[PDB]
């Protein structure tokens, strides 16, 4: 019931522990972790972080993100939608090769537009 | 029966088989490391994180739709597919794509796009 | 403690396992997991696979991906911001209606210009 502590250590170097100090749980030393739920899993802390030197992989129909998102680069393979103002910068906005901040017409007098105003 | 371990400091792990709920309380950090992977396999994944979610990777794939409140792009993207923005500007460098207009080829300006 | 593994089974069916053979932590058979702390969740693995099949919300001021983010679609709710070069091929990019690579514009004699060079 009542522990002062938690020391789980296992003969393949991995542990299981919970020091009250530092009110720290620490599963560290394992190969794998999985859990399966029928429900839902949560988290709620002000920091959550993944540090994964492979990938993060969202295998869902949907990931959700309240408030902002900020990534350094986005690729989207399958088209979207998007609302309200979207300000680009410090680069070329590209489709097709037609890049908007620069792009130029054949005018309607047999020259060229000149790049937009 | 059920599993209940409580700490000084008020941390609790315990898990109940008449809710089935795993619950882990009054903990100040948690982590898990590992050499291979961690997978979760449930319906439902919730995140409350009053300050940020952080996904330190060289890669966050996500298999299906994404949504977002709002987007930051740092350091550029592709996209590929049909793009379709409403509902206020698209701009690039200050040009707005849906009522830009040029100089046109006789001295005046054109319209916006058609 | 030292303990040579661990096998608890609850008599919903549930089981928490760690299993030195492999060095596998195992969760099973329960209806929801929760943490609740007050600093931080940290996972440092090199790969994490989350297999939701309703939704992953991450509810917080701000989701950051130090590097790529890659997505089926893409849906943004209210704006965003850009920099770098955002390359689109695949398809169109339009807003409100208006497609960048293919547009054209009145012209300033009263004609139309062509679709942009
Ligand atoms: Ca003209
Ligand atoms: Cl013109
Ligand atoms: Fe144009």
């Not at 250590?9 to 029928?38: H, M, N, Q, W």
């Not at 002000?46 to 969202?58: D, Q």
């Not at 901040?101 to 537009?113: E, F, L, Q, R, V």
Request: charged share 15%; glycine share 12%.
């Amino acid at each position: 019931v009542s522990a002062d502590a938690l020391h789980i250590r296992f003969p393949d170097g991995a542990v299981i522990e919970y020091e009250p100090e530092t009110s720290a749980l620490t599963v560290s030393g394992i190969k794998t972790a999985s859990v399966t739920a029928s429900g839902s899993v949560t988290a709620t802390v002000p920091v959550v972080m993944v540090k994964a030197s492979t990938r993060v992989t969202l295998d869902t129909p949907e990931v959700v993100c309240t408030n902002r998102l900020i990534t350094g680069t986005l690729e989207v393979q399958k088209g979207g939608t998007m609302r309200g103002n979207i300000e680009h910068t410090g680069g070329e906005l590209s489709s097709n090769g037609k890049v908007l901040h620069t792009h130029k017409h054949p005018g309607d007098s047999g020259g060229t537009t000149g790049s937009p105003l």
